[PDB]
Amino acid sequence: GPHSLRYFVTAVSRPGLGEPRYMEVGYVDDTEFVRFDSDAENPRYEPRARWMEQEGPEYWERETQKAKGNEQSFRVDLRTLLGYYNQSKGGSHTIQVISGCEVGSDGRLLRGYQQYAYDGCDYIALNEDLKTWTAADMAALITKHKWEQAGEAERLRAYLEGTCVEWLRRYLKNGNATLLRTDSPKAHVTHHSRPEDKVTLRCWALGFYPADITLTWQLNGEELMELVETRPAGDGTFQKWASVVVPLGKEQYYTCHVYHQGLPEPLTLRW
């Protein structure tokens, strides 16, 4: 399959309580593998996946100082954006960054992305071409213009096409046993009463990896439905559920179907 390296980046000003909080969290696919948090005792990049213990002192030093530069860089952006948006200097604000690359199974680039949001609204993003920017508003244009004049897209493209890809390969290979594994869903269906004479049928899928899965309910052929977003279960696997309200005495005519990378035939079950 194809795979991803992702960094979720967040800087959060806390005026009156000191310097902004800076976090970088990295994933390969759906697995958290690295993290820096400026609020840790002594902030440095740390492994979040066992396979990253392989990497030597130079790697952790190089990522940590990169991390610490970015912390400063986002420190400045927060102050800069107050200017851009004529904002008071006493409120807390957020910058978020999604940065990464996807590759296909041949280990070649499918997609690169880097997207910014200020206070939860889009600010700026690399476009798919990997040479131009799309800015969400008038403020983002100012930024856009700086990056064009400084040639940031081309530096970012060197990263998405070079550094980002080669390290994703490295990590997959280094974490093959964890990252290329598949754990299959185990499913089961639970029953609840209600009024007036109805019934909630809830289908559970548990213990699966990767996070991707599809749960559907059926009344004899036609697909039907409350659910939750697929969610991490604390050990590097995921779970989900999907429920339908049916008539009491008609439960047998409804079945739950579960489709996952680890199910050659999708599962079929009923209460």
């Binding site: 980046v9 990522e63 530069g69 860089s73 986002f74 400045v76 800069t80 940065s99 930024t143 980002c164």
Partner: peptide, 8 residues
């Protein structure tokens, strides 16, 4: 490995 982020 993360990118060195630019300023805005």
């Amino acid at each position: 490995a993360v990118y060195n982020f630019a300023t805005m």
